[PDB]
Design a binder for this molecule. Structure first.
Ligand SMILES: OC[C@H]1O[C@H](O[C@@H]2[C@@H](O)[C@H](O)O[C@H](CO)[C@@H]2O)[C@H](O)[C@@H](O)[C@H]1O
Lengths: 300, 303
């Protein structure tokens, strides 16, 4: 039988950045289509895009340093050191999906070292030499690292594109994985009947973010892990959820979780919808309903 | 009904550092006693020490910058910004438990910013002014940050203690959480091997460690996703130990027997050499078999 975690949202992680859920929101400006590659999972527990099981795999890169004429960078592997297979994902699992911005990362050797001198602040730009699908990315800060040095890089902060084609960091945009083409997790659309996609918002270090520090995702990481663990057969077109008060277990709103692993509500006329709900509530599965089951409006 | 995650180990996180499980081991040198404060949970889902629900809360510090008595640091809060209550727990939830080393962290404001110039490389030393239990730590790299600037710091790497009292980083050692007596601090209790040839199973992950006693390796007593699972399930503990099989999901073979105790740690009986689970593959899955007595004798594991 299908279930969602009985865990308060404010204790759970974003599925695109390793950061606690701070709020829920709907977006009129950005909610018409998203194609996030992290936080992508079916309700019967099939991982999609670059989505890992663990939050500890999120926004990390592993590779061997290459030195090329007018570029240095990484020949990419999976985080565990094993080969990257194109038949599995558009990039190695846990690869960041924050498109069209600079990635400021801390890179360390995957071999035992004595001193912090071998730890490098690197900058990955999304320009011509950004080709994760082809297994190669260019990175600044590697000029003094020996060729074939194996390193793990962890995303620290993001800033506007070095080439200046954008003024801000747009956390709704995914990368262009590179091609000469990647099998992306499919686009998510609001399915009609006044329904808006629910976004789980977390703060991440972003210089000039369109929404300041806020990064949206379509499902908490611990929900991803739960579905992968349970492998519950999908026995309906949508799973009806209640968002409960953690003290009283009283119903604060109705939500539909679709087989494609994203969630919707109908926001109240006023505007905000789930944004006015408290963030220490718990989702509970009620029953399977049709994809045209009409939800009561949520919020003020 | 009690269960453990049906997920391969190599896809799961260490519960002390946010890093994938690379191997299992028993420890002759360190396995007689551990008192890790992260990865601490009962089988019926009670969090202990500083253990968070989420791997994303691990090895993070949140606080407001102070300048006092020629030393700079943080008045600590919980990671969600809510107040840290002193004299109640060893430290805020997710606070690192890597004792007697320097913590090199990246600190960023919890308020929107325009430039990366506000992002600071800080060093937290475990010296006289390291008092997380009292809700205060000192850090190098904060002299140029305005008083009351609210920041989250994320652990990047650790190195030997600046004061030189130790030559390497020992990842088996927990912090001294103030000038308070360890007995008066509200620590998750010590874990002992329970007898009958049983050794504590340690889940090993690589973390960026300069001059580590075990190189990059950090041990923990349970995968983070196991912690979350027990907190979610709240399964009543109906036995003295939970018997597990470690299965190869590809070959359909039982690779070894393990006992998971109510205190949330796992044991095996290692072979004569004492290498035990270290030779097992890391892509296996644990499954709950049944509740057994503390005297239930396990088949030896390894080579
Ligand atoms: O050995 C203690 C200490 O080592 C590093 O500090 C050294 C410093 O002692 C030396 O004089 O200069 C180098 C070059 O930058 C380092 O700053 C670590 O930084 C420190 O955390 C501690 O591990």
């Amino acid at each position: 039988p299908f279930s969602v975690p009985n865990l308060p949202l404010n204790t759970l992680s974003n599925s695109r950045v390793p950061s606690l859920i701070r709020s829920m929101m709907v977006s009129r400006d950005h909610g018409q289509m998203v194609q996030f590659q992290n936080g992508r999972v079916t309700l019967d527990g099939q991982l999609q895009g670059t989505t890992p099981t663990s939050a500890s795999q999120l926004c990390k890169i592993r590779g061997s340093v290459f030195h090329a004429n007018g570029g240095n960078g990484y020949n990419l592997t999976e985080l565990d050191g094993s080969p990257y297979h194109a038949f599995e994902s558009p990039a190695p699992i846990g690869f960041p999906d924050l498109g069209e911005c600079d990635w400021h990362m801390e890179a360390s050797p995957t071999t035992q070292f004595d001193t912090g001198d071998v730890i490098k602040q690197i900058n990955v730009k999304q320009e011509a030499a950004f080709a994760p699908h082809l297994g190669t990315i260019q990175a600044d800060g590697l000029s003094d690292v020996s060729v074939n040095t194996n390193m793990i890089a962890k995303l620290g902060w993001v800033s506007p594109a070095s080439d200046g084609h954008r003024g801000n960091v747009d956390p709704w945009v995914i990368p262009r994985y590179g091609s000469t083409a990647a099998q992306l997790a499919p686009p998510i659309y609001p399915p009609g009947f006044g329904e808006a996609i629910v976004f789980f918002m977390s703060d991440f270090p972003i210089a000039h973010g369109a929404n300041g520090l806020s990064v949206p995702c379509t499902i908490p990481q611990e929900f991803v892990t739960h579905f992968v663990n349970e492998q519950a057969p999908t026995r309906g077109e949508a799973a009806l959820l209640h968002y409960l008060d953690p003290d009283t277990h009283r119903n604060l709103g109705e939500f539909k979780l679709y087989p494609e692993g994203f969630m919707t509500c109908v926001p109240n006329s006023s505007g905000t919808g789930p944004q006015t709900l408290p963030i220490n509530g718990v989702f509970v599965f009620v029953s399977w309903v049709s994809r045209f089951y009409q939800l009561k409006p949520v919020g003020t």
